[PDB]
Tab-separated table of C-alpha atoms and ligand atoms in Angstrom:
chain	number	residue	atom	x	y	z
W	543	UNK	CA	-0.823	-3.855	-24.335
W	544	UNK	CA	1.335	-4.197	-21.243
W	545	UNK	CA	0.228	-1.960	-18.343
W	546	UNK	CA	2.745	-0.195	-16.063
W	547	UNK	CA	1.769	1.191	-12.649
W	548	UNK	CA	3.675	2.695	-9.743
W	549	UNK	CA	3.198	2.482	-5.982
W	550	UNK	CA	4.722	5.369	-4.065
W	551	UNK	CA	5.791	3.696	-0.777
W	552	UNK	CA	5.932	0.507	1.313
W	553	UNK	CA	2.956	1.857	3.332
W	554	UNK	CA	0.890	2.358	0.164
W	555	UNK	CA	0.989	-1.175	-1.227
W	556	UNK	CA	-2.438	-2.721	-1.799
W	557	UNK	CA	-2.537	-6.405	-2.775
W	558	UNK	CA	-4.904	-5.890	-5.699
W	559	UNK	CA	-2.332	-3.607	-7.335
W	560	UNK	CA	0.395	-6.217	-6.921
W	561	UNK	CA	-1.054	-9.728	-7.266
W	562	UNK	CA	-0.131	-11.739	-10.410
W	563	UNK	CA	1.916	-8.865	-11.855
W	564	UNK	CA	5.602	-8.314	-12.497
W	565	UNK	CA	6.536	-6.285	-9.382
W	566	UNK	CA	9.732	-4.265	-9.421
W	567	UNK	CA	10.906	-3.191	-5.976
W	568	UNK	CA	13.018	-0.023	-5.700
W	569	UNK	CA	14.967	1.315	-2.706
W	570	UNK	CA	17.943	2.861	-4.525
W	571	UNK	CA	19.448	4.593	-1.500
W	572	UNK	CA	20.420	1.971	-0.579
W	573	UNK	CA	18.796	-1.479	-0.031
W	574	UNK	CA	18.160	-2.523	-3.645
W	575	UNK	CA	21.518	-1.075	-4.682
W	576	UNK	CA	23.050	-3.303	-2.014
W	577	UNK	CA	21.123	-6.412	-3.028
W	578	UNK	CA	21.951	-5.838	-6.698
W	579	UNK	CA	25.645	-5.267	-6.003
W	580	UNK	CA	26.056	-8.161	-3.604
W	581	UNK	CA	24.454	-10.690	-5.946
W	582	UNK	CA	26.460	-9.371	-8.872
W	583	UNK	CA	29.609	-9.975	-6.779
W	584	UNK	CA	28.842	-13.683	-6.355
W	585	UNK	CA	26.719	-13.692	-3.238
W	586	UNK	CA	24.717	-16.918	-3.095
W	587	UNK	CA	21.484	-15.493	-1.798
W	588	UNK	CA	19.971	-12.586	0.068
W	589	UNK	CA	17.326	-13.295	2.729
W	590	UNK	CA	15.354	-10.107	3.584
W	591	UNK	CA	13.662	-9.956	6.996
W	592	UNK	CA	11.646	-7.360	8.920
W	593	UNK	CA	13.208	-7.500	12.388
W	594	UNK	CA	16.608	-7.836	13.966
W	595	UNK	CA	15.323	-10.729	16.060
W	596	UNK	CA	14.216	-12.668	12.971
W	597	UNK	CA	17.635	-11.891	11.344
W	598	UNK	CA	19.553	-13.428	14.266
W	599	UNK	CA	17.351	-16.495	14.085
W	600	UNK	CA	17.943	-16.814	10.311
W	601	UNK	CA	21.759	-16.902	10.839
W	602	UNK	CA	21.452	-20.117	12.826
W	603	UNK	CA	19.492	-21.666	9.926
W	604	UNK	CA	22.078	-20.925	7.240
W	605	UNK	CA	25.200	-21.813	9.316
W	606	UNK	CA	28.871	-20.748	8.715
W	607	UNK	CA	28.135	-19.090	5.357
W	608	UNK	CA	25.629	-16.545	6.700
W	609	UNK	CA	26.430	-12.872	7.159
W	610	UNK	CA	24.366	-10.045	8.749
W	611	UNK	CA	23.820	-6.691	7.016
W	612	UNK	CA	21.393	-3.759	6.599
W	613	UNK	CA	20.580	-0.748	8.785
W	614	UNK	CA	18.397	1.178	11.140
W	615	UNK	CA	18.220	4.952	10.551
W	616	UNK	CA	20.959	4.365	7.948
W	617	UNK	CA	23.408	3.111	10.616
W	618	UNK	CA	25.053	-0.293	11.088
W	619	UNK	CA	23.070	-2.471	13.513
W	620	UNK	CA	24.846	-3.562	16.737
W	621	UNK	CA	26.294	-7.098	16.317
W	622	UNK	CA	25.915	-7.167	12.482
W	623	UNK	CA	28.753	-7.843	10.049
W	624	UNK	CA	28.046	-5.082	7.568
W	625	UNK	CA	26.018	-1.962	7.159
W	626	UNK	CA	23.951	-0.905	4.130
W	627	UNK	CA	26.708	0.527	1.929
W	628	UNK	CA	27.021	-1.276	-1.394
W	629	UNK	CA	30.860	-0.873	-1.323
W	630	UNK	CA	31.333	-3.137	1.621
W	631	UNK	CA	29.781	-6.101	-0.260
W	632	UNK	CA	32.845	-6.864	-2.337
W	633	UNK	CA	33.319	-10.251	-4.027
W	634	UNK	CA	35.941	-11.179	-1.439
W	635	UNK	CA	33.460	-10.566	1.359
W	636	UNK	CA	30.276	-11.998	-0.182
W	637	UNK	CA	31.170	-14.699	-2.673
W	638	UNK	CA	29.164	-17.840	-1.888
W	639	UNK	CA	27.774	-16.371	1.307
W	640	UNK	CA	24.164	-15.976	2.470
W	641	UNK	CA	23.264	-12.367	3.300
W	642	UNK	CA	20.616	-11.963	5.977
W	643	UNK	CA	19.379	-8.374	5.882
W	644	UNK	CA	16.835	-6.086	7.377
W	645	UNK	CA	16.455	-2.423	6.416
W	646	UNK	CA	14.316	0.617	7.142
W	647	UNK	CA	12.399	0.673	3.767
W	648	UNK	CA	13.550	-1.791	1.043
W	649	UNK	CA	12.996	-5.042	2.985
W	650	UNK	CA	9.401	-4.017	3.925
W	651	UNK	CA	8.566	-3.278	0.256
W	652	UNK	CA	9.938	-6.709	-0.810
W	653	UNK	CA	7.818	-8.622	1.692
W	654	UNK	CA	4.828	-6.395	0.806
W	655	UNK	CA	4.954	-7.562	-2.829
W	656	UNK	CA	4.646	-11.340	-2.065
W	657	UNK	CA	1.481	-11.856	-4.100
W	658	UNK	CA	3.092	-10.767	-7.391
W	659	UNK	CA	3.823	-13.356	-10.058
W	660	UNK	CA	7.465	-12.200	-10.207
W	661	UNK	CA	9.238	-9.916	-7.756
W	662	UNK	CA	12.244	-8.193	-9.365
W	663	UNK	CA	14.844	-6.134	-7.576
W	664	UNK	CA	15.637	-2.881	-9.319
W	665	UNK	CA	17.988	0.048	-8.961
W	666	UNK	CA	19.776	2.548	-11.162
W	667	UNK	CA	22.658	0.087	-11.372
W	668	UNK	CA	20.589	-2.616	-13.113
W	669	UNK	CA	17.840	-0.466	-14.665
W	670	UNK	CA	18.438	-1.499	-18.264
W	671	UNK	CA	18.650	-5.180	-17.372
W	672	UNK	CA	15.405	-4.890	-15.354
W	673	UNK	CA	13.653	-3.382	-18.344
W	674	UNK	CA	14.863	-6.271	-20.446
W	675	UNK	CA	13.504	-8.797	-17.907
W	676	UNK	CA	10.188	-6.942	-17.749
W	677	UNK	CA	9.729	-7.314	-21.496
W	678	UNK	CA	10.693	-11.020	-21.433
W	679	UNK	CA	8.224	-11.683	-18.594
W	680	UNK	CA	5.531	-10.167	-20.813
W	681	UNK	CA	3.116	-9.424	-17.959
W	682	UNK	CA	1.643	-6.213	-16.561
W	683	UNK	CA	3.992	-4.323	-14.268
W	684	UNK	CA	3.855	-2.493	-11.000
W	685	UNK	CA	6.889	-0.528	-9.825
W	686	UNK	CA	6.887	-0.620	-6.055
W	687	UNK	CA	8.799	2.315	-4.563
W	688	UNK	CA	9.923	1.576	-0.997
W	689	UNK	CA	9.914	5.333	-0.323
W	690	UNK	CA	11.324	6.401	3.012
W	691	UNK	CA	9.414	5.940	6.248
W	692	UNK	CA	6.222	5.229	4.324
W	693	UNK	CA	6.410	8.295	2.130
W	694	UNK	CA	6.833	9.152	-1.475
W	695	UNK	CA	10.566	9.637	-2.081
W	696	UNK	CA	12.084	11.408	-5.082
W	697	UNK	CA	15.045	8.962	-5.344
W	698	UNK	CA	12.833	5.899	-5.754
W	699	UNK	CA	10.452	7.812	-8.032
W	700	UNK	CA	13.045	9.045	-10.525
W	701	UNK	CA	14.633	5.610	-10.550
W	702	UNK	CA	11.189	4.205	-11.435
W	703	UNK	CA	11.068	6.710	-14.266
W	704	UNK	CA	14.445	5.659	-15.571
W	705	UNK	CA	13.379	2.042	-15.643
W	706	UNK	CA	10.042	2.833	-17.296
W	707	UNK	CA	11.980	4.814	-19.875
W	708	UNK	CA	14.198	1.816	-20.565
W	709	UNK	CA	11.122	-0.329	-21.051
W	710	UNK	CA	9.866	2.261	-23.537
W	711	UNK	CA	13.169	2.148	-25.396
W	712	UNK	CA	12.423	-1.572	-25.861
W	713	UNK	CA	8.773	-1.225	-26.795
W	714	UNK	CA	5.824	0.875	-27.875
W	715	UNK	CA	2.936	-1.496	-26.840
W	716	UNK	CA	2.627	0.131	-23.418
W	717	UNK	CA	-0.036	1.757	-21.265
W	718	UNK	CA	1.255	3.804	-18.304
W	719	UNK	CA	-0.823	4.933	-15.336
W	720	UNK	CA	-0.585	8.633	-14.547
W	721	UNK	CA	1.817	7.826	-11.653
W	722	UNK	CA	4.129	6.015	-14.063
W	723	UNK	CA	3.821	8.683	-16.749
W	724	UNK	CA	4.782	11.298	-14.113
W	725	UNK	CA	7.842	9.347	-12.913
W	726	UNK	CA	8.991	8.876	-16.493
W	727	UNK	CA	8.496	12.612	-17.065
W	728	UNK	CA	10.625	13.510	-14.049
W	729	UNK	CA	13.345	11.144	-15.272
W	730	UNK	CA	13.149	12.198	-18.938
W	731	UNK	CA	13.705	15.863	-17.848
W	732	UNK	CA	16.601	14.956	-15.513
W	733	UNK	CA	18.364	12.023	-17.206
W	734	UNK	CA	21.543	12.354	-15.173
W	735	UNK	CA	19.421	11.492	-12.077
W	736	UNK	CA	22.046	12.811	-9.568
W	737	UNK	CA	20.894	16.406	-9.864
W	738	UNK	CA	17.251	15.899	-9.098
W	739	UNK	CA	17.707	13.434	-6.267
W	740	UNK	CA	19.339	16.278	-4.302
W	741	UNK	CA	15.755	17.629	-3.804
W	742	UNK	CA	14.723	14.448	-1.936
W	743	UNK	CA	14.269	14.845	1.837
W	744	UNK	CA	16.184	11.532	2.212
W	745	UNK	CA	19.204	13.016	0.459
W	746	UNK	CA	19.804	15.297	3.452
W	747	UNK	CA	19.833	12.164	5.593
W	748	UNK	CA	22.319	10.413	3.320
W	749	UNK	CA	24.508	13.517	3.496
W	750	UNK	CA	24.444	13.877	7.246
W	751	UNK	CA	25.580	10.245	7.465
W	752	UNK	CA	28.617	11.102	5.226
W	753	UNK	CA	27.489	8.756	2.472
W	754	UNK	CA	28.541	10.876	-0.516
W	755	UNK	CA	30.435	7.838	-1.927
W	756	UNK	CA	27.369	5.570	-1.701
W	757	UNK	CA	25.219	8.312	-3.282
W	758	UNK	CA	27.502	8.719	-6.319
W	759	UNK	CA	27.801	4.967	-6.729
W	760	UNK	CA	24.025	4.327	-6.581
W	761	UNK	CA	23.484	6.890	-9.326
W	762	UNK	CA	25.649	4.948	-11.809
W	763	UNK	CA	23.589	3.596	-14.723
W	764	UNK	CA	23.672	0.073	-16.111
W	765	UNK	CA	26.755	-1.296	-14.420
W	766	UNK	CA	25.002	-4.476	-13.287
W	767	UNK	CA	23.456	-6.879	-15.872
W	768	UNK	CA	21.816	-9.061	-13.241
W	769	UNK	CA	18.177	-8.950	-12.161
W	770	UNK	CA	17.739	-10.411	-8.719
W	771	UNK	CA	14.455	-12.057	-8.021
W	772	UNK	CA	12.629	-12.675	-4.724
W	773	UNK	CA	11.091	-16.146	-4.561
W	774	UNK	CA	9.946	-18.107	-1.507
W	775	UNK	CA	11.674	-15.776	0.982
W	776	UNK	CA	15.005	-15.656	-0.845
W	777	UNK	CA	16.653	-13.472	-3.434
W	778	UNK	CA	18.913	-15.065	-6.071
M	1394	UNK	CA	7.983	26.197	9.445
M	1395	UNK	CA	4.708	25.222	7.814
M	1396	UNK	CA	4.709	21.682	6.362
M	1397	UNK	CA	2.978	20.844	3.053
M	1398	UNK	CA	2.095	17.268	2.071
M	1399	UNK	CA	0.128	15.692	-0.755
M	1400	UNK	CA	-2.151	12.659	-0.909
M	1401	UNK	CA	-2.496	11.160	-4.368
M	1402	UNK	CA	-6.104	9.843	-4.334
M	1403	UNK	CA	-9.342	9.383	-2.370
M	1404	UNK	CA	-8.331	5.719	-1.818
M	1405	UNK	CA	-4.963	6.751	-0.354
M	1406	UNK	CA	-6.156	8.997	2.468
M	1407	UNK	CA	-4.924	7.956	5.913
M	1408	UNK	CA	-6.367	9.824	8.906
M	1409	UNK	CA	-2.992	10.497	10.511
M	1410	UNK	CA	-1.953	12.467	7.423
M	1411	UNK	CA	-5.114	14.566	7.576
M	1412	UNK	CA	-6.169	15.127	11.198
M	1413	UNK	CA	-5.790	18.671	12.638
M	1414	UNK	CA	-4.265	20.006	9.408
M	1415	UNK	CA	-5.427	22.428	6.747
M	1416	UNK	CA	-6.728	19.967	4.112
M	1417	UNK	CA	-7.179	21.180	0.559
M	1418	UNK	CA	-9.362	18.917	-1.565
M	1419	UNK	CA	-8.800	18.899	-5.340
M	1420	UNK	CA	-10.941	17.335	-8.084
M	1421	UNK	CA	-10.415	19.913	-10.846
M	1422	UNK	CA	-12.122	17.944	-13.608
M	1423	UNK	CA	-14.714	18.656	-12.408
M	1424	UNK	CA	-16.215	18.427	-8.867
M	1425	UNK	CA	-14.182	21.116	-7.081
M	1426	UNK	CA	-14.408	23.358	-10.144
M	1427	UNK	CA	-18.176	22.952	-9.885
M	1428	UNK	CA	-18.328	23.612	-6.150
M	1429	UNK	CA	-16.080	26.661	-6.506
M	1430	UNK	CA	-18.087	28.077	-9.408
M	1431	UNK	CA	-21.492	27.445	-7.890
M	1432	UNK	CA	-20.630	29.103	-4.579
M	1433	UNK	CA	-19.031	32.028	-6.370
M	1434	UNK	CA	-22.327	32.460	-8.270
M	1435	UNK	CA	-24.336	32.898	-5.062
M	1436	UNK	CA	-25.243	29.338	-4.214
M	1437	UNK	CA	-26.162	29.122	-0.533
M	1438	UNK	CA	-24.516	25.829	0.245
M	1439	UNK	CA	-23.262	22.617	-1.282
M	1440	UNK	CA	-24.013	19.326	0.501
M	1441	UNK	CA	-21.717	16.520	-0.778
M	1442	UNK	CA	-22.942	12.932	-0.373
M	1443	UNK	CA	-21.646	9.489	-1.354
M	1444	UNK	CA	-24.741	7.823	-2.817
M	1445	UNK	CA	-27.682	8.699	-4.995
M	1446	UNK	CA	-30.023	7.321	-2.343
M	1447	UNK	CA	-28.598	9.635	0.330
M	1448	UNK	CA	-28.865	12.571	-2.170
M	1449	UNK	CA	-32.595	11.973	-2.720
M	1450	UNK	CA	-33.114	11.835	1.022
M	1451	UNK	CA	-31.191	15.116	1.506
M	1452	UNK	CA	-33.533	16.940	-0.951
M	1453	UNK	CA	-36.492	16.309	1.335
M	1454	UNK	CA	-34.527	17.863	4.228
M	1455	UNK	CA	-33.711	21.130	2.463
M	1456	UNK	CA	-37.145	21.649	0.796
M	1457	UNK	CA	-38.030	23.866	-2.250
M	1458	UNK	CA	-34.557	25.432	-2.474
M	1459	UNK	CA	-32.668	22.160	-3.009
M	1460	UNK	CA	-31.261	21.089	-6.358
M	1461	UNK	CA	-29.595	17.794	-7.427
M	1462	UNK	CA	-26.281	17.699	-9.315
M	1463	UNK	CA	-23.088	15.671	-9.902
M	1464	UNK	CA	-22.337	12.586	-12.007
M	1465	UNK	CA	-21.615	8.939	-12.450
M	1466	UNK	CA	-18.980	8.061	-15.077
M	1467	UNK	CA	-19.059	11.781	-15.956
M	1468	UNK	CA	-22.737	11.588	-17.016
M	1469	UNK	CA	-25.836	13.278	-15.584
M	1470	UNK	CA	-27.620	11.019	-13.079
M	1471	UNK	CA	-31.215	9.967	-13.924
M	1472	UNK	CA	-33.720	12.258	-12.120
M	1473	UNK	CA	-31.117	14.946	-11.195
M	1474	UNK	CA	-31.406	18.626	-12.098
M	1475	UNK	CA	-27.874	19.192	-13.314
M	1476	UNK	CA	-24.781	17.327	-14.298
M	1477	UNK	CA	-21.182	18.075	-13.275
M	1478	UNK	CA	-20.366	20.851	-15.749
M	1479	UNK	CA	-19.441	24.112	-14.046
M	1480	UNK	CA	-21.221	26.134	-16.811
M	1481	UNK	CA	-24.644	24.924	-15.895
M	1482	UNK	CA	-24.351	26.404	-12.366
M	1483	UNK	CA	-25.033	29.973	-13.407
M	1484	UNK	CA	-26.143	32.611	-10.885
M	1485	UNK	CA	-29.671	32.472	-12.287
M	1486	UNK	CA	-29.835	28.744	-11.624
M	1487	UNK	CA	-28.043	28.536	-8.262
M	1488	UNK	CA	-28.463	31.796	-6.391
M	1489	UNK	CA	-29.741	31.068	-2.878
M	1490	UNK	CA	-30.224	27.392	-3.621
M	1491	UNK	CA	-28.891	24.315	-1.805
M	1492	UNK	CA	-26.886	22.008	-4.081
M	1493	UNK	CA	-27.006	18.343	-3.135
M	1494	UNK	CA	-24.250	16.544	-5.029
M	1495	UNK	CA	-22.587	13.218	-5.371
M	1496	UNK	CA	-19.674	12.538	-7.725
M	1497	UNK	CA	-17.295	9.781	-8.765
M	1498	UNK	CA	-14.126	11.200	-7.027
M	1499	UNK	CA	-14.393	14.705	-5.460
M	1500	UNK	CA	-17.216	13.978	-2.982
M	1501	UNK	CA	-15.386	10.874	-1.613
M	1502	UNK	CA	-12.192	12.914	-1.032
M	1503	UNK	CA	-14.185	15.613	0.848
M	1504	UNK	CA	-15.796	13.132	3.228
M	1505	UNK	CA	-12.420	11.360	3.608
M	1506	UNK	CA	-10.834	14.543	5.003
M	1507	UNK	CA	-13.335	15.012	7.915
M	1508	UNK	CA	-10.711	14.891	10.658
M	1509	UNK	CA	-8.809	17.939	9.353
M	1510	UNK	CA	-8.969	21.201	11.273
M	1511	UNK	CA	-10.076	23.033	8.103
M	1512	UNK	CA	-11.236	21.470	4.850
M	1513	UNK	CA	-10.758	23.851	1.900
M	1514	UNK	CA	-12.049	23.334	-1.603
M	1515	UNK	CA	-9.473	24.049	-4.267
M	1516	UNK	CA	-9.222	24.184	-8.030
M	1517	UNK	CA	-7.297	26.058	-10.689
M	1518	UNK	CA	-10.054	28.667	-10.644
M	1519	UNK	CA	-9.435	29.661	-7.004
M	1520	UNK	CA	-5.802	28.554	-6.609
M	1521	UNK	CA	-4.405	31.937	-5.622
M	1522	UNK	CA	-7.197	32.578	-3.136
M	1523	UNK	CA	-6.657	29.103	-1.615
M	1524	UNK	CA	-2.984	29.857	-1.139
M	1525	UNK	CA	-3.922	33.066	0.607
M	1526	UNK	CA	-6.298	31.193	2.956
M	1527	UNK	CA	-3.635	28.569	3.652
M	1528	UNK	CA	-1.222	31.243	4.842
M	1529	UNK	CA	-3.884	32.947	7.003
M	1530	UNK	CA	-4.813	29.608	8.610
M	1531	UNK	CA	-1.146	29.239	9.554
M	1532	UNK	CA	-1.305	25.466	10.067
M	1533	UNK	CA	0.403	22.530	8.363
M	1534	UNK	CA	-1.178	21.545	5.065
M	1535	UNK	CA	-2.142	18.418	3.238
M	1536	UNK	CA	-3.318	18.643	-0.369
M	1537	UNK	CA	-5.777	15.836	-0.919
M	1538	UNK	CA	-6.022	14.864	-4.593
M	1539	UNK	CA	-9.298	13.068	-5.342
M	1540	UNK	CA	-7.565	11.341	-8.272
M	1541	UNK	CA	-9.803	9.299	-10.523
M	1542	UNK	CA	-11.155	5.917	-9.490
M	1543	UNK	CA	-8.700	5.759	-6.602
M	1544	UNK	CA	-5.635	6.526	-8.666
M	1545	UNK	CA	-3.058	9.203	-8.987
M	1546	UNK	CA	-4.304	11.647	-11.635
M	1547	UNK	CA	-2.148	14.203	-13.441
M	1548	UNK	CA	-4.903	16.892	-13.449
M	1549	UNK	CA	-5.268	16.919	-9.667
M	1550	UNK	CA	-1.495	16.646	-9.210
M	1551	UNK	CA	-0.524	19.612	-11.382
M	1552	UNK	CA	-3.295	21.653	-9.808
M	1553	UNK	CA	-1.773	20.794	-6.408
M	1554	UNK	CA	1.535	22.044	-7.749
M	1555	UNK	CA	0.035	25.305	-8.899
M	1556	UNK	CA	-1.451	25.915	-5.487
M	1557	UNK	CA	1.768	24.986	-3.680
M	1558	UNK	CA	3.560	27.398	-5.982
M	1559	UNK	CA	1.142	30.160	-5.029
M	1560	UNK	CA	1.795	29.451	-1.373
M	1561	UNK	CA	5.513	29.762	-2.109
M	1562	UNK	CA	4.943	33.094	-3.827
M	1563	UNK	CA	3.484	34.217	-0.477
M	1564	UNK	CA	6.150	32.710	1.746
M	1565	UNK	CA	9.556	31.149	2.227
M	1566	UNK	CA	9.013	29.478	5.683
M	1567	UNK	CA	7.921	26.201	4.094
M	1568	UNK	CA	8.845	22.526	4.217
M	1569	UNK	CA	7.470	20.380	1.366
M	1570	UNK	CA	7.289	16.590	1.354
M	1571	UNK	CA	8.788	14.937	-1.709
M	1572	UNK	CA	5.248	14.402	-3.112
M	1573	UNK	CA	4.561	18.129	-2.830
M	1574	UNK	CA	7.967	19.109	-4.197
M	1575	UNK	CA	7.294	16.834	-7.211
M	1576	UNK	CA	3.840	18.320	-7.895
M	1577	UNK	CA	5.266	21.825	-7.685
M	1578	UNK	CA	8.031	20.763	-10.084
M	1579	UNK	CA	5.531	19.429	-12.614
M	1580	UNK	CA	3.559	22.675	-12.370
M	1581	UNK	CA	6.605	24.979	-12.435
M	1582	UNK	CA	7.730	23.294	-15.725
M	1583	UNK	CA	4.236	23.496	-17.276
M	1584	UNK	CA	2.728	26.729	-15.917
M	1585	UNK	CA	-0.008	26.921	-18.530
M	1586	UNK	CA	-1.392	23.652	-17.037
M	1587	UNK	CA	-3.581	22.847	-20.117
M	1588	UNK	CA	-0.736	21.246	-22.036
M	1589	UNK	CA	0.350	18.740	-19.455
M	1590	UNK	CA	-3.108	17.671	-18.359
M	1591	UNK	CA	-3.563	16.211	-21.863
M	1592	UNK	CA	-1.269	13.341	-20.673
M	1593	UNK	CA	-3.761	12.371	-17.930
M	1594	UNK	CA	-5.709	9.145	-18.560
M	1595	UNK	CA	-8.833	11.034	-17.352
M	1596	UNK	CA	-8.408	13.608	-20.108
M	1597	UNK	CA	-9.315	10.965	-22.699
M	1598	UNK	CA	-12.497	10.385	-20.714
M	1599	UNK	CA	-13.326	14.088	-20.610
M	1600	UNK	CA	-12.776	14.211	-24.370
M	1601	UNK	CA	-14.930	11.237	-25.217
M	1602	UNK	CA	-17.738	12.899	-23.247
M	1603	UNK	CA	-17.373	16.051	-25.462
M	1604	UNK	CA	-16.384	18.232	-22.525
M	1605	UNK	CA	-13.798	20.398	-24.298
M	1606	UNK	CA	-15.613	23.529	-22.991
M	1607	UNK	CA	-15.490	22.330	-19.366
M	1608	UNK	CA	-11.804	21.398	-19.795
M	1609	UNK	CA	-10.800	24.861	-21.058
M	1610	UNK	CA	-12.848	26.554	-18.360
M	1611	UNK	CA	-11.376	24.480	-15.492
M	1612	UNK	CA	-7.874	25.405	-16.623
M	1613	UNK	CA	-8.514	29.143	-16.136
M	1614	UNK	CA	-6.375	30.588	-13.325
M	1615	UNK	CA	-7.555	32.818	-10.500
M	1616	UNK	CA	-11.001	33.761	-11.717
M	1617	UNK	CA	-12.653	32.929	-8.393
M	1618	UNK	CA	-11.592	34.761	-5.174
M	1619	UNK	CA	-13.686	32.545	-2.919
M	1620	UNK	CA	-12.447	29.607	-0.858
M	1621	UNK	CA	-15.260	27.239	-0.046
M	1622	UNK	CA	-14.969	25.359	3.173
M	1623	UNK	CA	-16.494	22.030	4.261
M	1624	UNK	CA	-17.804	22.146	7.826
M	1625	UNK	CA	-20.294	19.826	9.528
M	1626	UNK	CA	-21.429	18.193	6.263
M	1627	UNK	CA	-21.899	21.442	4.347
M	1628	UNK	CA	-19.836	23.630	2.078
M	1629	UNK	CA	-20.226	27.427	2.268
U	1968	LIG	O1	16.940	6.164	6.760
U	1968	LIG	C1	18.026	5.930	6.192
U	1968	LIG	O2	18.985	6.738	6.100
U	1968	LIG	C2	18.166	4.584	5.589
U	1968	LIG	O3	16.917	4.267	4.980
U	1968	LIG	C3	19.322	4.637	4.609
U	1968	LIG	S1	19.416	3.258	3.688
U	1968	LIG	O4	18.088	2.625	3.379
U	1968	LIG	O5	20.459	2.369	4.229
U	1968	LIG	O6	20.010	3.639	2.401
U	1969	LIG	O1	-15.208	9.784	-14.548
U	1969	LIG	C1	-15.536	10.911	-14.971
U	1969	LIG	O2	-15.504	11.269	-16.176
U	1969	LIG	C2	-15.996	11.880	-13.949
U	1969	LIG	O3	-15.150	11.722	-12.814
U	1969	LIG	C3	-15.932	13.263	-14.566
U	1969	LIG	S1	-16.185	14.455	-13.437
U	1969	LIG	O4	-15.671	14.129	-12.063
U	1969	LIG	O5	-17.575	14.936	-13.524
U	1969	LIG	O6	-15.448	15.641	-13.891
U	1970	LIG	MG1	13.861	4.405	-0.417
U	1971	LIG	MG1	-10.060	13.980	-10.078
């Protein structure tokens, strides 16, 4: 029986809960929705980093084809090319390019999962496809919520639940931890997702930044069939 | 506005989330249900410790009036007087006595909350009274779930939700973290408590130990009006 666990934030990752597992990183509003979208639109790779300084250094390494995106406090970073809205990573803008990004939550969670056997990037947009990859990988799972500012966040949690549910649709040989069971419960009783996310503290932040469009987009189910994977510092 | 947070397990306590707050420790199956019951039945004090060796040493300090209780793996510890069933701490057995105890989860969570301004002991049995003490104390709150074996546990989580709900019944000037909001949600949609706890991994453990009686008892609401408090290594 495949085991499924959940970690509630980037500041609550412990190696022993991650190593040798299938880790699924979630930051649905908005980092993993961005990564998922960009790669689906023909982006060559995403390189997540922790600091702006390291991001500017990484540009020089990848040459003409590198672009700078992400955010601090949800805002575009001075001197970057793009922000952290999935809509701005259109095929025209990203095809074949190398996206250097650093974000408030998502990028920390990705780096924090290094010891896993496979690091998958998950979101509402590719939830079904992630569940399918989870089953294929046939290994125990930990769903790593980025949270927001090192705290449990309802958006990442319900999205975990959706994905767990999709895994369950594909098989019965499962054992959930109580954290996973609870996420799945929250999802199962709020399938539309949108409604319940409005209780997240982070939702007020998304609203005061005028990101209603990004919010509605990131709640769309199963529009991306791709499962990005972090490997040796790169996501393809 | 009073802030309410939640910590999901004894292994997830971070000082900065606890210091100077009102901390409410929960291990409803069964340590905090025991402490609550024992003190309500006229027990003089409870002294929680981390090891059996430290427990045997503490007996010598408190003399004739000391008794030994708690558990490992839910079982009575060799040479102890009582186990970790609330029913065995009757008034006849505990009145005026000093209860030295060590348990798998609850006692770790209590010690882990030392830096709080006030450490309260909470359970389903004294949930309402805890909420009343929380309001009186008029300080920000963290609800510290003991969990089981360092993991998020549905029993402690729903019990947190019940208590948060009771605080809400007594006031509107609140700000919940997403973790607290989620617990309250789980409770609010499962008010009877009993039903939903049966999904906890720990429930199977309680059942295979034949503790159906303890389980039904620990799910009883508002039968104890006392709020035990941990102060300088002692609970009164
Ligand atoms: O704090 C924020 O608003 C950011 O985390 C928003 S986002 O990660 O770009 O979605
Ligand atoms: O592992 C266990 O069964 C114990 O934690 C049970 S109890 O804490 O005595 O309720
Ligand atoms: Mg997030
Ligand atoms: Mg417990």
